[PDB]
RNA sequence: GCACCACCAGGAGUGGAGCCUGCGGCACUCAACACACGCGCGCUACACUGACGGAGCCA
């Protein structure tokens, strides 16, 4: 039911990709860090089909626009590639706050159910790690048309005051290539 | 020099501070059937030969 | 090693797989110390090292200290590695390897 | 006479570690934190035992002017209160004053090395902890202390072997516990029934070694 | 710690029994009871029903020699009021 | 141990005289003239600037007085300037550790002729009269340490003294110079090493060599 | 129970010189004495496993 997520980059990460992969590692009890000794193996289909996993995340960098995230659901094969805003130097965080088994509440703003809805399913289908389903933190997905923003906040009540807690990195992605997948 | 040869028969658990010390019930070969409990350091499996330095002394637990 | 097992076949014949194994055995520390915390002041505690580690440390001190001695001199890797295998297979306390075995045991004995 | 480096571990020698040294800098062009600012310590939130360069200065004028260093069997390692670890070349000239001493310690602590004025040599070096990385292979380690029992230098150094070196650990501070090397030694040693300074104790170990090793 | 509770407990109880043994023919305030052995069995009931065997297999032959004397003590004392024969057989076996 | 004075001319002790000490005052406030802080001002007087070295004599005071042969009551320390002003050191004085505080103490000593507490009338630092022989004991050995002089062994030389024959040593408190500063006093000039030593190293050499001699711990 | 900011085992980086990339901001061991720039990543050198010359040969 809950997915099994694998994270992978090119053979040459620097520090700025290392800490970034450390933040992306922080979506566990099902997020695992792993490099390849080739750049990207073409046998990853036997890797995921043999391992039985469902989803794959790839970090790389190209020069059509700058740096790129890639998400794919493995057996069917839809694959969204997204573009990032900032990869320069994020926070060196690998675990702080709670654990990532805590399923937060999930917020989508600026409802577009015309053609971004396939995205809104996948983000629902990704972040259901853990048996919690009871909110301790919160993750925010802000549409601004084709600009989205990512937030992580912790509930800080004070004298029954609903104060947010900014933690972790602040992302702002754009819809890059989204390949029309299959029923296969 | 009293170099004593002992033999692992059964491990107990993992104790000690830094997490390498296994309390191991040993039985040394020459003049057998007289058991001692010591503190090993590295990886220890069953039926391995440990070399005791001193022959009559025992401790159990490290914080 | 193809050169070194010629040199050991020349110097003191002793078919040179002999001189390796004795250098494996006679450099192993028969006991060791660990850094137990205890609260602030770390006591060291005399413990008895597992024989998988006695194999592995014997590989370590030979290959490191030979390259240390081979650093900045006329002799090469294979020649100073030939020195370490002869001087440790017979316990002579002249090599780098034999000296480190006794220096650990004189800590564990001093603190058992 | 050959010059001793840390690359060799074989030659039997004498090594002194002036540990817990009082080396702190301050901005107001950096100076050593001391006469000059003895009344500006708590006013800047600093300590009194941090204001003592004369102890380490007088121990360098003690050790580096000894005959046994001119005999060439001496190495000096200096360890501050923060853990800054210093190799001192036996051919270095200490400036006999306080001022060039102060500026030379500032340029040492911020350039991390003071290289040769004549050749391609390091004169003063900063190295990594532990101190056991840079001492000879078979070496006795002791600590001079008032509260440790009195021994003589000469007979005790005459217990040493052909290769067995000696390093001693000296507290170059104002006062406090004699426990700065509890990890390191085989032995706590003493020299007198009276409370001893660092420099006079270092001199007793020097000339005790010179009467021990037939150095005149 | 658990086997150290057992070894400290047995060194205490044998340490008192040997003291009372040479009473006058050869002319510690607390563990808790009038006798320490009522301590000894009840701490056996203090530890839990699962994986106390790990606490037993830690303990060497000296634990056995100091151990069986409390068994003969409570089986001459006819105390079923603070331990029970299933516990005694369940440990001794 | 009673405090050793110049009035005791019988007891076998160790006497050290630091001769030709650079002790000179100056009005600007009275200061002690050093090479560092008064360089061009000593150039104005037409002097040898390099001899203005009170740090050597300070280092010999802290070297001699902190040794346990002072603490045992066998040591006595005298100061003779280059101008010959003779100062007896009370063997229970505590010299300042830093150069500036010792500088001010030397200022008040050269201007007040006696440094004392308000509790004690026993002078901690006293100005007395030449020659040194009126304050040395009767049975006392007089030597000058010189590299030009033959080299002896210290423990053998003290073992070749008599049962109450003392010994006084002359150290020229200077950076460079000859040993002819006190030839009118001495019995012998000896040496200590094959190397040219400083003053404080020779002082600790005969201190701890004498403590090896008289077996003082 | 679980974890490479949970420890023991070890390895590998930055942090020194240079070059740029992006980003940021503008009382006393001493009575007396005297008290504009920056940060971090990549890139380039210093090694004596050294030079120089050939010949062989694998995606």
From Swiss-Prot, chain A:
The keyword Electron transport does not apply. Changing residue 170 to A: Loss of RNA binding. The keyword Nucleus applies. One of its GO terms (cellular component) is Mpp10 complex. Residues 3-184 form the Brix domain. One of its GO terms (biological process) is rRNA processing. Keywords: Nucleus, Ribonucleoprotein, Ribosome biogenesis, rRNA processing. It is found in: Nucleus, Nucleolus. GO terms for molecular function: RNA folding chaperone; rRNA primary transcript binding; single-stranded telomeric DNA binding; snoRNA binding. Required for the early cleavages at sites A0, A1 and A2 during 18S ribosomal pre-RNA processing. Component of a heterotrimeric complex containing IMP3, IMP4 and MPP10. Interacts with MPP10. Component of the ribosomal small subunit (SSU) processome composed of at least 40 protein subunits and snoRNA U3. This is U3 small nucleolar ribonucleoprotein protein IMP4. It comes from Saccharomyces cerevisiae (strain ATCC 204508 / S288c) (Baker's yeast). The gene is IMP4. The chain holds residues 84 to 267 of 290 of the full protein.
Curated annotation (Swiss-Prot), chain B:
PROSITE patterns: RIBOSOMAL_S28E. It comes from Saccharomyces cerevisiae (strain ATCC 204508 / S288c) (Baker's yeast). The keyword Cytoplasm applies. One of its GO terms (biological process) is ribosomal subunit export from nucleus. CDD domains: S1_S28E. Gene3D superfamilies: Nucleic acid-binding proteins (2.40.50.140). It is found in: Cytoplasm. Belongs to the eukaryotic ribosomal protein eS28 family. SUPFAM superfamilies: Nucleic acid-binding proteins. Keywords: Acetylation, Cytoplasm, Ribonucleoprotein, Ribosomal protein. The gene is RPS28A. Its main location: cytoplasm. This is Small ribosomal subunit protein eS28A. Present with 94500 molecules/cell in log phase SD medium. There are 2 genes for eS28 in yeast. GO terms for cellular component: cytosol; cytosolic small ribosomal subunit. Component of the ribosome, a large ribonucleoprotein complex responsible for the synthesis of proteins in the cell. The small ribosomal subunit (SSU) binds messenger RNAs (mRNAs) and translates the encoded message by selecting cognate aminoacyl-transfer RNA (tRNA) molecules. The large subunit (LSU) contains the ribosomal catalytic site termed the peptidyl transferase center (PTC), which catalyzes the formation of peptide bonds, thereby polymerizing the amino acids delivered by tRNAs into a polypeptide chain.
UniProtKB/Swiss-Prot annotation, chain C:
The gene is RPS5. Belongs to the universal ribosomal protein uS7 family. It is found in: Cytoplasm. GO terms for molecular function: mRNA binding; rRNA binding; structural constituent of ribosome. This is Small ribosomal subunit protein uS7. Component of the ribosome, a large ribonucleoprotein complex responsible for the synthesis of proteins in the cell. The small ribosomal subunit (SSU) binds messenger RNAs (mRNAs) and translates the encoded message by selecting cognate aminoacyl-transfer RNA (tRNA) molecules. The large subunit (LSU) contains the ribosomal catalytic site termed the peptidyl transferase center (PTC), which catalyzes the formation of peptide bonds, thereby polymerizing the amino acids delivered by tRNAs into a polypeptide chain. There is a cross-link at residue 90 (Glycyl lysine isopeptide (Lys-Gly) (interchain with G-Cter in ubiquitin)). GO terms for cellular component: 90S preribosome; cytoplasm; cytosol; cytosolic small ribosomal subunit; ribosome. One of its GO terms (biological process) is ribosomal small subunit assembly. Its main location: cytoplasm. Component of the small ribosomal subunit (SSU). Mature yeast ribosomes consist of a small (40S) and a large (60S) subunit. The 40S small subunit contains 1 molecule of ribosomal RNA (18S rRNA) and 33 different proteins (encoded by 57 genes). The large 60S subunit contains 3 rRNA molecules (25S, 5.8S and 5S rRNA) and 46 different proteins (encoded by 81 genes).
Swiss-Prot record, chain D:
It is found in: Nucleus, Nucleolus. Its EC number is 2.1.1.260. It comes from the Eukaryota. SUPFAM superfamilies: alpha/beta knot. Changing residue 196 to S: Almost complete loss of SAM binding. No effect on growth and ribosome biogenesis. It catalyses: pseudouridine(1191) in yeast 18S rRNA + S-adenosyl-L-methionine = N(1)-methylpseudouridine(1191) in yeast 18S rRNA + S-adenosyl-L-homocysteine + H(+). The record marks 54 as: Stabilizes Arg-88. GO terms for biological process: endonucleolytic cleavage in 5'-ETS of tricistronic rRNA transcript (SSU-rRNA, 5.8S rRNA, LSU-rRNA); endonucleolytic cleavage in ITS1 to separate SSU-rRNA from 5.8S rRNA and LSU-rRNA from tricistronic rRNA transcript (SSU-rRNA, 5.8S rRNA, LSU-rRNA); endonucleolytic cleavage to generate mature 5'-end of SSU-rRNA from (SSU-rRNA, 5.8S rRNA, LSU-rRNA); maturation of SSU-rRNA; ribosomal small subunit biogenesis; rRNA base methylation; rRNA methylation; rRNA processing. Disruption phenotype: Depletion of EMG1 affects growth and leads to strong ribosome biogenesis defects, with defects in 20S pre-rRNA and mature 18S rRNA species. InterPro entries: Alpha/beta_knot_MTases, Rbsml_bgen_MeTrfase_EMG1/NEP1, tRNA_m1G_MTases_N. Changing residue 54 to G: Loses its exclusive nucleolar localization and mislocalizes to the cytoplasm. Pfam families: EMG1. The record marks 52, 93, 96, 100 as: Interaction with substrate rRNA. GO terms for cellular component: 90S preribosome; cytoplasm; nuclear microtubule; nuclear periphery; nucleolus; nucleoplasm; nucleus; small-subunit processome. S-adenosyl-L-methionine binds at residues 144, 171, 176-178, 191-196.
